[PDB]
């Protein structure tokens, strides 16, 4: 009953659009990450940003077209199913 104010309102996101995911894995052998993307049969950008000072953590950059919010979430969930990943950033 009742409703919250319009403050802290989540902004309108225009789908479809390229969404950016940050994937930190402890391997340079990125297969599963691209595999989960390729199943959508859509193109995607695979980038390497930087690696920790011990070369232990590899920061990967993924950017793909999401047609809706459900994809945006499910894909992010697949990113955590790699196991190689130590930290997923789904901002």
From Swiss-Prot:
It comes from the Bacteria. Transmembrane segments: none annotated. It holds the Pfam family DUF493. To C.jejuni CJ0253. This is Uncharacterized protein HP_0495. It comes from Helicobacter pylori (strain ATCC 700392 / 26695) (Campylobacter pylori).
């Amino acid at each position: 009953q009742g409703h919250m104010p319009s403050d802290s309102k989540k902004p309108t996101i225009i789908y479809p659009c390229l969404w950016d995911y940050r994937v930190i894995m402890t391997t340079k052998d990125t297969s599963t990450l691209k595999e989960l993307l390729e199943t959508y049969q859509r193109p995607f950008k695979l980038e390497f940003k930087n690696t920790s000072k011990n070369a232990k953590f590899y920061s990967f950059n993924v950017s793909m077209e999401v047609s809706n919010e459900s994809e945006r979430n499910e894909i992010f969930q697949k990113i955590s199913q790699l196991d190689k990943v130590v930290q997923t950033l789904g901002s």
